[PDB]
């Protein structure tokens, strides 16, 4: 699974089900602390599903997405 690491609102998201990501690739952006901060893939994989959308509330450990390689 991949998850947000801080409280905020999920400024934008760049994945969809069936997309592919690689460790350290950008995946979303998080608005908090009166800044915007990138969110990067904890691991590579095909995206199985996305659990969030643009502007949704997010938190530390709150899920962003699920993979066709999430350990498994």
Swiss-Prot record:
Residue numbers bearing the N6-lipoyllysine modification: 34
Positions of the Biotinyl-binding domain: 1-68
InterPro entries in the cross-refs: Biotin_Carboxyl_Carrier/Decarb (IPR050709), Biotin_lipoyl (IPR000089), Single_hybrid_motif (IPR011053)
Modified residues (N6-biotinyllysine): 34
Pfam families tied to this protein: Biotin_lipoyl
Swiss-Prot/TrEMBL induction comment: Detected in log-phase B.subtilis cells (at protein level).
Keywords: Biotin, Lipoyl
Domain of life: Bacteria
Modifications made to the protein after synthesis: Can be both biotinylated and lipoylated on Lys-34 upon overexpression in E.coli depending on the growth medium; the nature of the modification in situ in B.subtilis is unknown.
NCBIfam families reported in the protein's UniProt record: PRK05889.1 (NF004547), PRK08225.1 (NF006079)
Protein name: Biotin/lipoyl attachment protein
